[PDB]
């Protein structure tokens, strides 16, 4: 097998078991990792579902490659303890992550400089008796707080709101959209899908700015 | 009135002047009197080709010209370079050929001219005047021991491009003449590289000067005054290039003019992409080649 | 790559864990009347089975040597480990199968898949008088 | 590609014209000419071969397999290869993970048509080899697959299909194949420049864009998965939502004409 | 479709699906036709013009004579082309030294045998190479033959193109054999294949059945008892289908091995199973289900209602099969089984003696006789035959033909005419073969 | 025990071929003009290969650079749909494959006039589509197209063919069914000569046949580079007759 | 990590072949002398040919077989180079080419060839079998590794013994080592590989269209010899005169008629060395048993 790790004897197996509008909620914390220059802590708990995750910043790191006019972002999603999302399922989100911050970050302030983003999908409850799609907007919030902690030039507190398998990311207090994500749902529910996302965005950004300006 | 060409063909991987045509591994002759040049290797008599190409016998010189290969750089040629890299006081820049050309630091037109003399602080500003991927007019000076050659801009006429659009072709169809900058009705100008690189732009006064400020030789600016009637006229000359390229046509400046007026059937400029219609206009000119000269 | 080795080494050299603590005493799920299931558990004592445990250490904001905190954080996790109740089927459907040779044949043994309970669990037995702690 | 800045203005100028202008000057809703070949890998359940105008090139293969449809959830698998790249790269894995979502088993896929018995069915393999691309290649790739499913025959059931009591091992005839009846989806690449929305972004058009979309077409309508999508990352701008609302019917009132051009046999 | 090579040579694709382990595995092959296909006979002068050496540098031997058995016109001189079925029915009739000296084997007929039976396929492989001066067998590779190759027609089963190609195979033959007036006789047993030539559909062709060929021999009396072939008190059951037993094997439902039927008790026998320790008895005449002793069969356990003390689902039977091993550890009430399929018959040629009750003295015609076998454990065989008054005080060779549903004792046919009962030479002979002793002299391929 | 018929006593193979016969052999030139200047397609029976060549051109890194000659990269793509049975895992570092990646390099270290292409890169791309056995010599014949397909400097044709041995008898142009049935040898044959580029034997071979066995494949191999030549030439005529 | 040799030194050896000389003192077609010595363990051996030194190790343990061949045991050979044996090498590069050139040979030389009965590793079918292991170590290179590792593995198989087994379903009784004896293994055939080493004294064309065969082939390239060679060829045979493998993977072009003429000379070489192993296996085991005679009479 893998000669680099301790994976036990091969013939063992893990243990098996069988059967015998609501509120979302946060707890947002910064400044707790001394390796980084930007850290952010996120608790989330909603109705069957409790979620905690860590966003980590390293920047500006040097680039051994070549010259660029401006900065470059690198984003990692890694499984924590229990929930195991698929590998190719991860990087699609990482693709969707980078597009929004490329309408956020003053890379032109940062020539030949790198951005390292480590996201640790650390622990999630789903006690409910598109499972990754329910965790998208909280990432952007978790990144933004850590990116404020490294103090990097950011245009807006941009945030995403969720309405039932749909993720829409805003700026300008919702007056423009910067990132769009849709799974199955209804048809032409878009206009209501504007709304419930927007107000959570209207909730969340206020929760964020409270976390920093009051500190 | 369409969106896309969707024509279907299912059940197949594919649809399925005399001179010496020789192969590699093949004997030409063993007359020792012949001289042995390009495309030729040998063992003391046995004249052996190395490519798919033609026997060229020049008066005692036998050599093999291939049919397929990259662009061959030669001196004094007027081509277009895309900026690959920056070196010590050197630059790397694609020809399209085998390798990059090189370009000395003082090989370029300085703003203010020669009154601006040398400075070691200029290598602290290599990226100032030039950076990657950019397009320009270049003059082929001389070579190295291999066959890699270098460039320069010994004129105002050579320099960094603007005011238009690039296209590219195989190097074969571009015909040689004593002139390469050409000016076309529509107030516009083709800059045919030899190597297969083609830049269009709006006719400048310096272009007009050819047939009757200096601090703008590294700008990313254009003329701000660019009409759509300029811009849409660019595209009509643009596709007819690829029409002749798809039709395997040697480029004549007049043929382009002949391509342009034959394209006046179609005002819908987006219809200039059709495999048949490009071939039809391609068929037009070859028939029109059988009248004049 | 050193760390997970180095712990495991002195965990062996701690002599914390007799394999008696890994001995699993499974039950059998009696298919009882009118379609109900109760797992007959034997108590206070044909195949045997053994737990094999795993750990994962995540390290955030490394500021120095880590090994002592690698040690000590495990120790409190060790005391919190419940052993979940494992049981086998009453009579599992997954039984002996035969494989034909080029004239001969053999028998695959019956595949009794152990199942841990959704509910019941017992704690872990520890040589508690050998639970160390670390210091550099 | 690496292009020059003086173009990049003019290219961003001309396409953001209010009488909007493509570099090839098509109408804003046009696509580019292509070629579509199938049915040429006779070891396969179906084959496909598609040719772009810039010479981007792919082939998608169809191999099937009989499976128990109860012990396995995913009845339909996509697996992609791009030439020239590592497995580990980004654009690989996202496009790979995408079409799985696009072909979820009951979202636009009619897995009842895949169903063999009350116990068994057909595992299929969407196996993809891209020779070359110069584009964000995705909407090309769906097109050959659409023809690939329209070029796929399957061997005929002989025996019965109720294996709960009798538990029969299913039997196929050795010559008689039947075409997979299926309604496969389609994917379209979009791009936003200024106040204009082009269709089939070529690589130059793909470079200069502020932002772009991917819209899932199925069953004669718009459906999920739908993703806003970056093409470059030097020119990423945000966007008014009615422009997002604009493009949907802008896709849709030209979508089936492309489909009917390919629904053409 | 098909394509052409520059040697005038054809190439096309034969493609199918491998059904092994229930899988659906599509298998494609290319296929070639050649135009150097030999007709392999004495009289033709043009197929010896095209014969080319092998890798061992040999041009082979064209052995079917100008002189067959000539018969009554419109037969005249003729060759014989066969059915697989007439071979499958009458494989030993072919091995008569007295007759059938010149037979083309078609390639498809060769394949169905190789599809059907492996050691029967040995015998045709044996006979063709061991053809002699007397008897001559060739194999014509007709679907390697360009001029006899056919395709799958639209809306067709594989059986149709089999009969059509064999019909196509014969069609080329007389065309090549018009110049010498040696005909070609197609022998069949299929009544629908004996229907399409009644109108003489395309070819003025010799479509006769076995007996319809047999009734034209000069010496047909000696051989018609080698032609293969109420009688009811109850009805015997049947054997399970293909998907049923292959569906039975993996689940642990079904079992195979060998069975021993007792002589002191003709109606009771046990098997030795790989999963099972003790010999598991099978009790009951219907439960033995018309198989013979020593054969490879496929068995099923019986419910405890039929177990012996000295449902729909297979969910029940497996849990009952566990209870068998409990009852195997009992040895007080032990389980019973019955057969549900026969893995293989251990049939061969068999030698016995007839019953004096079965024969009429005054009769000269065809009649039923039963053969008392030399094997004590195996039952008698109804033999519908003429010359029983001859053969009653004589030893005989039979071969078992079939077991249909009704017949309590099987249908078989007499094969070889041996000699007088308790004559020393004949009792020497069957003492060899029923003890499996080879005795036949060394053949023509041996002495080379 | 095989329930099938390997080689007839009547001299025939599975499709009816003789022991000294080939499959249908089809090449093509300039299959992908928009992709690279080397683009050639092979059908040798159902062995179907797309062959692609890039160069002579600049490296990605100055580390991977020489001031004497070219480099040669081999990238083999075996698809999971290449066979009947679909292979589970990918092959991209499989040690079986890397051997061939070594092999074609040293086979083609010595046709390329390496000195006259220094500081540049040759990359050879392989796409194995449909696999029919005889797989090794299938490749090399596709290579010999692709170098000429751009007209790279070389000495000679190079031919490749697997020839198998059923007990005494050589088999030109085996298939994978026959490959798993007996012992086979592939020969990398150079031009018109009797000198070898590739020689590879996996199966167990009695010694005494081998000289004769080697004496077989040359006539096949000479007919290979035969059929490559004119097929290029009739293409080669199609250029200038309609170019001019 | 690059070996640097002058072109002056390059011509020097190339001249020596042109006057039929080689630097070691052997003939062209002469092989080194082989020192085989066993350690105390079974499947323990040190093998030495002048400068090249190797060491390998055979072991076995209990595992289940695959689904693939559920009948048969498990076996594989490790050949991980350490840069101990020469500073050219990476720390355990399993992805280097020459490594693969060392690998696939020994893969085909042993595993696909099957000198060893893997079915005689079946303890119980599908439940418990053997996992037999072959770790090859290199010590110091003068070339001939792939011939040395050819030998030293096959040396090791004829010296390893496995212990005693008793089966009762799950009750699988591995006995104590010293009460119940270890049991050696079943070798179907003994393969010996041969390196061939090739030198064009000329250009390409006189090899290509120079019809005159003029190419020198030698056995067991030394280190300096090995760095200039033009083709690479290894054949492998037995005592029963069958050819195990041949591998000319490219390099220099090469006449066929040479290769048969080459491979015949392989035969007489390998046979004598083979029997030298065979006596020493006996003679050491004789020395084991004479010291076993020097033990029981002692004890």
UniProtKB/Swiss-Prot annotation, chain A:
Organism superkingdom: Eukaryota
Entry GO terms, CC: cytoplasmic exosome (RNase complex); exosome (RNase complex); nuclear exosome (RNase complex); nucleolus; nucleus
Pfam families linked to this entry: RNase_PH
Subcellular location as annotated: Cytoplasm; Nucleus, Nucleolus
Chief place of localization: cytoplasm
InterPro entries the UniProt entry points to: ExoRNase_PH_dom1, PNPase/RNase_PH_dom_sf, Ribosomal_Su5_D2-typ_SF, RNase_PH
Biological process terms in GO annotation: exonucleolytic trimming to generate mature 3'-end of 5.8S rRNA from tricistronic rRNA transcript (SSU-rRNA, 5.8S rRNA, LSU-rRNA); nuclear mRNA surveillance; nuclear polyadenylation-dependent CUT catabolic process; nuclear polyadenylation-dependent rRNA catabolic process; poly(A)-dependent snoRNA 3'-end processing; RNA catabolic process; RNA processing; rRNA catabolic process
Keywords carried by this UniProt record: Cytoplasm, Exosome, Nucleus, RNA-binding, rRNA processing
GO molecular function: RNA binding
Assembly and interaction partners: Component of the RNA exosome complex. Specifically part of the catalytically inactive RNA exosome core complex (Exo-9) may associate with the catalytic subunits RRP6 and DIS3 in cytoplasmic- and nuclear-specific RNA exosome complex forms. Exo-9 is formed by a hexameric base ring of RNase PH domain-containing subunits and a cap ring consisting of CSL4, RRP4 and RRP40.
More info: Present with 7380 molecules/cell in log phase SD medium.
Protein family (similarity comment): Belongs to the RNase PH family.
Protein's name according to its UniProt entry: Exosome complex component MTR3
Lineage: Eukaryota, Fungi, Dikarya, Ascomycota, Saccharomycotina
Encoding gene (name): MTR3
UniProtKB/Swiss-Prot annotation, chain B:
Keyword vocabulary terms for this entry: Acetylation, Cytoplasm, Exosome, Nucleus, Phosphoprotein, RNA-binding, rRNA processing
Gene3D superfamilies: 2.40.50.100, Nucleic acid-binding proteins
Family note: Belongs to the RRP4 family.
Keyword Magnesium: no
Function: Non-catalytic component of the RNA exosome complex which has 3'->5' exoribonuclease activity and participates in a multitude of cellular RNA processing and degradation events. In the nucleus, the RNA exosome complex is involved in proper maturation of stable RNA species such as rRNA, snRNA and snoRNA, in the elimination of RNA processing by-products and non-coding 'pervasive' transcripts, such as antisense RNA species and cryptic unstable transcripts (CUTs), and of mRNAs with processing defects, thereby limiting or excluding their export to the cytoplasm.
Miscellaneous information on this protein: Present with 4840 molecules/cell in log phase SD medium.
Superkingdom per UniProt: Eukaryota
GO biological process: CUT catabolic process; exonucleolytic trimming to generate mature 3'-end of 5.8S rRNA from tricistronic rRNA transcript (SSU-rRNA, 5.8S rRNA, LSU-rRNA); nuclear mRNA surveillance; nuclear polyadenylation-dependent rRNA catabolic process; nuclear-transcribed mRNA catabolic process; poly(A)-dependent snoRNA 3'-end processing; RNA catabolic process; RNA processing
GO molecular function, one term: RNA binding
Cellular localization per UniProt: Cytoplasm; Nucleus, Nucleolus
Positions of post-translational N-acetylserine modification: 1
Tagged with keyword DNA-binding: no
Transmembrane segments: none
Higher taxonomy: Eukaryota, Fungi, Dikarya, Ascomycota, Saccharomycotina
From Swiss-Prot, chain D:
Quaternary structure annotation from Swiss-Prot or TrEMBL: Component of the RNA exosome complex. Specifically part of the catalytically inactive RNA exosome core complex (Exo-9) which may associate with the catalytic subunits RRP6 and DIS3 in cytoplasmic- and nuclear-specific RNA exosome complex forms. Exo-9 is formed by a hexameric base ring of RNase PH domain-containing subunits and a cap ring consisting of CSL4, RRP4 and RRP40.
Organism: Saccharomyces cerevisiae (strain ATCC 204508 / S288c) (Baker's yeast)
Stored CDD domains: RNase_PH_RRP42
GO CC annotations, alphabetized: cytoplasmic exosome (RNase complex); exosome (RNase complex); nuclear exosome (RNase complex); nucleolus; nucleus
Similarity comment text for this entry: Belongs to the RNase PH family.
Entry-linked PANTHER family: EXOSOME COMPLEX COMPONENT RRP42, EXOSOME COMPLEX EXONUCLEASE RIBOSOMAL RNA PROCESSING PROTEIN
Localization per Swiss-Prot or TrEMBL: Cytoplasm; Nucleus, Nucleolus
Keyword Ribonucleoprotein tagged: no
One GO MF term: mRNA 3'-UTR AU-rich region binding
Superkingdom of source: Eukaryota
Name listed for the protein in its UniProt record: Exosome complex component RRP42
Note: Present with 7110 molecules/cell in log phase SD medium.
Keyword Coiled coil tagged: no
InterPro entries: Exosome_comp_Rrp42_subfam (IPR050590), PNPase/RNase_PH_dom_sf (IPR027408), Ribosomal_Su5_D2-typ_SF (IPR020568)
A GO biological process held by the record: rRNA catabolic process
Keywords: Cytoplasm, Exosome, Nucleus, RNA-binding, rRNA processing
From Swiss-Prot, chain E:
Family: Belongs to the RNR ribonuclease family.
Any one GO BP annotation for this protein: regulatory ncRNA 3'-end processing
Domain CSD1: 233-346
Protein's recorded name: Exosome complex exonuclease DIS3
Record region (Endoribonuclease): 1-227
A Gene Ontology molecular function term of the record: 3'-5'-RNA exonuclease activity
Listed result of changing residue 163 to A: Abolishes endoribonucleolytic activity; no effect on growth. No growth
Localization per record: Cytoplasm; Mitochondrion; Nucleus, Nucleolus
Note: Present with 606 molecules/cell in log phase SD medium.
GO cellular component: cytoplasmic exosome (RNase complex); exosome (RNase complex); mitochondrion; nuclear exosome (RNase complex); nucleolus; nucleus
Lineage: superkingdom: Eukaryota
Keywords: Cytoplasm, Endonuclease, Exonuclease, Exosome, Hydrolase, Mitochondrion, Nuclease, Nucleus, RNA-binding, rRNA processing
Subunit structure: Component of the RNA exosome complex. Specifically part of the catalytically inactive RNA exosome core complex (Exo-9) which associate with the catalytic subunits RRP6 and DIS3 in cytoplasmic- and nuclear-specific RNA exosome complex forms. Exo-9 is formed by a hexameric base ring of RNase PH domain-containing subunits and a cap ring consisting of CSL4, RRP4 and RRP40; DIS3 associates with the base ring of Exo-9. Interacts with GSP1.
N-terminal signal peptide: none
Outcome following mutation: residue 190 to A: Abolishes endoribonucleolytic activity; no effect on growth. No growth
Source taxonomy: Eukaryota, Fungi, Dikarya, Ascomycota, Saccharomycotina
Part of the intact protein present: 9 to 501 of 1001
Main location: cytoplasm
Entry keyword annotation includes Oxidoreductase: no
Residue span, CSD2 domain: 369-436
């Amino acid at each position: 097998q893998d000669r680099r790790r301790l994976l036990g004897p091969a013939a063992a197996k893990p243990m098996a078991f069988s059967n015998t509008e609501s509120e979302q909620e946060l707890s947002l914390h910064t400044g707790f990792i001394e390796n980084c220059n930007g850290s952010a802590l996120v608790e989330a708990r909603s109705l069957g579902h409790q979620t905690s995750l860590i966003t980590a910043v390293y920047g500006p790191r040097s680039i051994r490659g070549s010259f660029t006019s401006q900065g470059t972002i690198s984003i990692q999603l890694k499984n924590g303890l229990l929930e195991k999302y698929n590998t190719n399922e991860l990087k699609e989100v990482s693709s969707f992550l980078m597009g929004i911050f490329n309408s956020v970050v003053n890379l032109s302030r940062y020539p030949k400089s790198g951005i390292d983003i480590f996201v640790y999908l650390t622990y999630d409850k789903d006690l409910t008796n598109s499972q990754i799609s329910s965790l998208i907007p909280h990432c952007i919030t978790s990144i933004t707080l850590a990116l404020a902690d490294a103090g990097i030039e950011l245009v807006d507190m941009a945030g995403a709101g969720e309405a039932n398998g749909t993720v829409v990311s805003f700026i300008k207090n919702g007056e423009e959209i910067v990132g769009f994500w849709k799974d199955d749902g209804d048809d032409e529910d878009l206009l209501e899908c504007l709304d419930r996302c927007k107000e959570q965005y209207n909730r969340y950004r206020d929760l964020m700015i409270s976390c920093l300006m009051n500190q | 009135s369409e969106v896309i060409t969707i024509t279907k063909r299912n059940g197949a991987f594919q649809n399925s002047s005399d001179s010496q045509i020789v192969t590699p591994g093949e004997l030409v002759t063993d007359d020792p009197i012949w001289m042995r040049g390009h495309g030729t290797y040998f063992l003391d008599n046995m004249t052996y080709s190395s490519v798919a190409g033609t026997v060229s016998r020049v008066n005692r010189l036998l050599s093999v010209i291939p049919l397929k290969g990259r662009y061959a750089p030669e001196t004094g040629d007027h081509v277009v370079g895309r900026i690959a890299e920056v070196g010590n006081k050197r630059w790397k820049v694609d020809i399209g050929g085998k390798q990059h050309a090189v370009l000395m630091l003082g090989s370029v037109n300085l703003p203010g001219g020669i009154l601006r003399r040398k400075s070691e602080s200029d290598e602290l500003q290599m990226r100032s005047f030039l950076k990657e991927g950019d397009l320009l007019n270049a003059e082929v000076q001389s070579l190295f021991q291999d066959g890699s050659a270098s460039l320069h801009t010994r004129s105002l006429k050579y320099g960094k491009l603007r005011n238009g659009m690039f296209c590219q072709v195989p190097s074969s169809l571009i015909v040689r003449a004593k002139n390469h900058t050409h000016n076309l009705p529509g107030n516009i100008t083709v800059v045919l590289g030899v190597n297969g690189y083609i830049w269009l732009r709006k006719t400048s006064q310096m272009d007009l000067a050819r047939d009757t400020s200096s601090w703008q030789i590294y700008s990313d600016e254009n003329d701000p005054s660019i009409s759509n009637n300029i811009r849409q006229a660019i595209c009509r000359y643009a596709n007819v290039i690829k029409a002749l390229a798809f039709c395997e046509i040697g480029i004549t400046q007049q043929r382009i003019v002949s391509a342009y007026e034959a394209s006046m059937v179609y005002s819908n400029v987006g219809e200039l992409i059709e495999k048949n219609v490009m071939e039809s206009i391609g068929s037009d000119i070859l028939t029109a080649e059988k009248m004049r000269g | 790559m050193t760390i997970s080795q180095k712990l495991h080494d002195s965990i062996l050299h701690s002599r914390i864990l007799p394999k008696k603590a890994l001995k699993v005493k499974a039950g059998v799920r009696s298919a009882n009347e009118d379609g109900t299931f109760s797992v007959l558990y034997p108590d206070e004592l044909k195949r045997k089975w053994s737990y094999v445990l795993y750990a994962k250490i995540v390290v955030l904001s490394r500021t120095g040597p880590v090994f002592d905190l690698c040690w000590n954080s495990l120790m409190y996790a060790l005391q919190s480990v419940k052993l979940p109740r494992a049981f086998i089927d009453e009579r599992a459907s997954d039984l002996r199968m035969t494989i034909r040779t080029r004239g001969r044949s053999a028998t695959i043994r019956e595949t009794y898949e152990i199942i841990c309970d959704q509910t019941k669990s017992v704690p872990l037995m520890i040589n508690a008088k050998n639970i160390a702690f670390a210091s550099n | 590609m690496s292009l020059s800045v003086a173009e990049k203005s003019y290219l961003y100028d001309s396409l953001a014209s209010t009488p909007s202008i493509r570099p090839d000057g098509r109408l804003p809703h046009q696509f580019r000419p292509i070629e579509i070949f199938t049915d040429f890998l006779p070891s396969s359940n179906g084959s496909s071969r598609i040719i772009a105008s810039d010479g981007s090139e792919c082939i998608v293969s169809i191999k099937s397999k009989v499976v128990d449809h109860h012990v396995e959830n995913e009845l339909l698998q996509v697996d992609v290869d791009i030439a020239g790249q590592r497995d580990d790269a980004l654009v690989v894995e996202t496009i790979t993970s995408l079409l799985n979502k696009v072909l979820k088993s009951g979202s636009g896929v009619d897995s009842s048509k895949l169903q063999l018995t009350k116990k068994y069915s057909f595992k299929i393999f969407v196996d993809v080899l891209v020779i070359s691309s110069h584009s964000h290649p995705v909407s090309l790739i769906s097109f050959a697959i659409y023809s690939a499913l329209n070029s796929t025959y399957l061997p005929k059931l002989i025996s019965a299909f109720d294996d709960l009591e009798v538990e029969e091992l299913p039997t196929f005839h050795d010559y008689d194949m039947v075409k997979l009846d299926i309604n496969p989806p389609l994917v379209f690449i979009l791009a936003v420049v200024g106040n204009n929305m082009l269709l089939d972004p070529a690589a130059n058009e793909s470079e200069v864009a502020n932002n772009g979309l991917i819209i899932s077409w199925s069953n004669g309508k718009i459906t999920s998965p739908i993703r806003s999508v970056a093409l470059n990352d030097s020119n990423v701008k945000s966007f008014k939502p009615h422009l997002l609302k604009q493009g949907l019917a802008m896709v849709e009132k030209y979508a089936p004409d492309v489909v009917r051009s390919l629904e053409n046999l | 479709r098909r394509k052409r090579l520059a040697d005038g040579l054809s190439v096309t694709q034969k493609v199918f699906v491998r059904s092994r382990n229930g899988g659906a595995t599509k298998i494609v092959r290319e296929h070639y036709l050649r135009s150097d296909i030999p007709c392999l006979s004495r009289s033709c002068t043009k197929c010896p013009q095209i014969v080319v050496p092998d890798a061992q540098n040999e041009l082979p031997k064209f052995i079917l004579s100008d002189s067959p058995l000539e018969l009554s016109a419109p037969i005249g001189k003729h060759y014989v082309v066969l059915d697989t079925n007439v071979v499958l029915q009458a494989i030993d009739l072919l091995e008569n030294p007295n007759c059938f000296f010149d037979v083309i084997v078609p390639q498809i007929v060769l394949d169905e045998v190789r599809n059907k039976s492996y050691p029967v396929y040995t015998r045709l492989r044996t006979l063709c190479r061991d053809s002699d001066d007397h008897k001559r067998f060739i194999v014509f590779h007709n679907e390697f033959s360009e001029h006899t190759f056919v395709e799958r027609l639209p809306n067709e089963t594989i059986n149709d193109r089999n009969d059509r190609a064999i019909r196509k195979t014969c069609q080329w033959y007389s065309e090549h054999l018009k110049p010498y007036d040696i005909n070609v006789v197609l022998v069949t047993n299929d009544r629908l294949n004996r229907e399409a030539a009644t109108k003489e559909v395309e070819s003025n062709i010799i479509t006769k059945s076995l007996v319809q060929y047999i009734e034209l021999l000069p010496n047909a009396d000696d051989i018609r008892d080698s032609i293969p072939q109420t009688f009811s008190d109850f009805t015997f059951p049947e054997y399970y289908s293909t998907a049923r037993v292959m569906g039975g094997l993996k689940n642990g439902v079904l079992y195979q091995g060998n069975i021993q039927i007792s002589e002191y008790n003709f109606l009771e026998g046990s098997v030795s199973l790989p999963r099972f320790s003790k010999p598991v008895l099978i009790v009951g005449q219907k439960n033995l289900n018309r198989a013979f002793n020593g054969d490879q069969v496929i068995v099923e356990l019986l419910p405890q209602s039929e177990w012996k003390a000295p449902v729909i689902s297979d969910k029940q039977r497996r849990l009952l099969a566990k209870d068998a091993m409990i009852a195997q550890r009992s040895k007080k009430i032990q389980p019973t089984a019955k057969v549900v399929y026969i893995q293989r018959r251990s049939w061969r040629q068999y030698v016995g003696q007839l019953a004096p009750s079965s024969v009429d003295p005054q009769s000269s015609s065809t009649q039923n006789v039963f053969v008392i076998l030399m094997d004590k454990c195996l039952p008698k065989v109804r033999i519908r035959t003429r010359r029983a008054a001859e053969l009653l005080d004589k030893r005989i060779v039979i071969s078992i033909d079939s077991w249909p549903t009704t017949h309590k004792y099987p249908l078989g046919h007499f094969v070889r005419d041996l000699g007088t009962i308790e004559s020393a030479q004949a009792e020497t002979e069957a003492l060899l073969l029923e003890h499996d002793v080879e005795y036949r002299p060394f053949s023509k391929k041996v002495l080379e | 025990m095989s329930r099938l018929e390997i080689y007839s006593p009547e001299g025939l193979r599975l499709d009816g071929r003789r022991w000294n016969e080939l499959r249908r052999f089809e090449s093509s030139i300039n299959t992908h003009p928009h992709a690279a200047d080397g683009s050639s397609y092979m059908e040798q029976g159902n062995n179907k290969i797309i062959t692609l060549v890039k160069g002579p051109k600049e490296p990605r890194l100055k580390s991977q650079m020489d001031t004497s000659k070219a480099l040669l990269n081999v990238s083999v793509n075996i698809t999971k749909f290449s066979k009947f049975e679909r292979s589970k895992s990918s092959h991209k570092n499989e040690r079986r494959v890397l051997e061939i990646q070594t092999s074609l390099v040293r086979m083609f270290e010595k046709n390329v006039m390496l000195n006259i292409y220094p500081r540049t890169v040759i990359d050879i791309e392989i796409h194995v589509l449909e696999q029919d056995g005889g797989i090794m010599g299938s490749l090399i014949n596709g290579i010999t197209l692709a170098l000429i397909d751009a007209g790279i400097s070389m000495f000679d044709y190079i031919s490749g063919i697997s020839v198998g041995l059923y007990d005494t008898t050589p088999l030109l142009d085996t298939n994978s069914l026959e490959e798993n049935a007996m012992s086979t040898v592939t020969l990398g044959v150079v031009g018109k000569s009797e000198k070898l580029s590739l020689l590879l034997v996996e199966d167990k071979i009695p010694l005494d046949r081998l000289e004769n066995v080697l004496a077989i494949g040359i006539a096949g191999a000479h007919r290979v580079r035969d059929l490559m030549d004119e097929e290029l030439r009739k293409h080669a005529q199609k250029r200038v007759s309609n170019a001019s | 990590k690059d070996i640097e040799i002058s072109a002056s030194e390059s011509k020097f050896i190339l001249e020596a072949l042109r006057q039929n000389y080689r630097l070691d003192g052997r003939s062209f077609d002469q092989f080194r002398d082989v020192e085989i010595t066993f350690g105390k363990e079974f499947g323990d051996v040190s093998v030495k040919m002048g400068n090249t030194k190797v060491h390998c190790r055979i072991s076995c343990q209990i595992a289940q077989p695959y689904e693939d061949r559920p009948f048969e045991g498990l076996f594989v050979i490790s050949t991980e180079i350490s840069p101990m044996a020469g500073s050219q090498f990476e720390n355990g590069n399993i992805t280097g080419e020459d490594e693969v050139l060392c690998s696939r040979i020994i893969e085909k030389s042993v595993r696909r060839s099957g000198a060893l009965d893997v079915e005689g590793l079946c303890i119980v079918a599908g439940s418990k079998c053997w996992a037999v292991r072959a770790d090859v170590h290199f010590l110091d290179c003068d070339g001939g590794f792939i011939d040395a590792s050819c030998i030293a593995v096959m040396a090791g198989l004829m010296h390893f013994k496995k212990p005693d087994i008793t089966v009762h379903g799950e009750q699988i009784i591995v006995h104590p080592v010293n009460e119940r004896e270890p049991v050696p293994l079943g070798i179907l055939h003994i393969p010996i590989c041969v390196t061939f080493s090739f030198f064009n004294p000329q250009d390409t064309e006189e090899n290509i269209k120079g019809e005159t065969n003029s190419e020198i082939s030698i056995i067991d390239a030394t280190l300096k010899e090995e760095l200039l060679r033009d083709g690479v060829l290894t054949v492998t045979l037995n005592k029963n005169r069958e050819v195990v493998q041949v591998s000319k993977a490219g390099g220099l072009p090469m006449d066929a008629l040479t290769l048969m003429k080459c491979c015949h000379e392989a035969y007489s070489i390998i046979e004598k060395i083979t029997d030298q192993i065979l006596q020493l296996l006996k003679e050491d085991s004789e020395k084991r048993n004479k010291y076993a005679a020097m033990l029981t009479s002692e004890n």
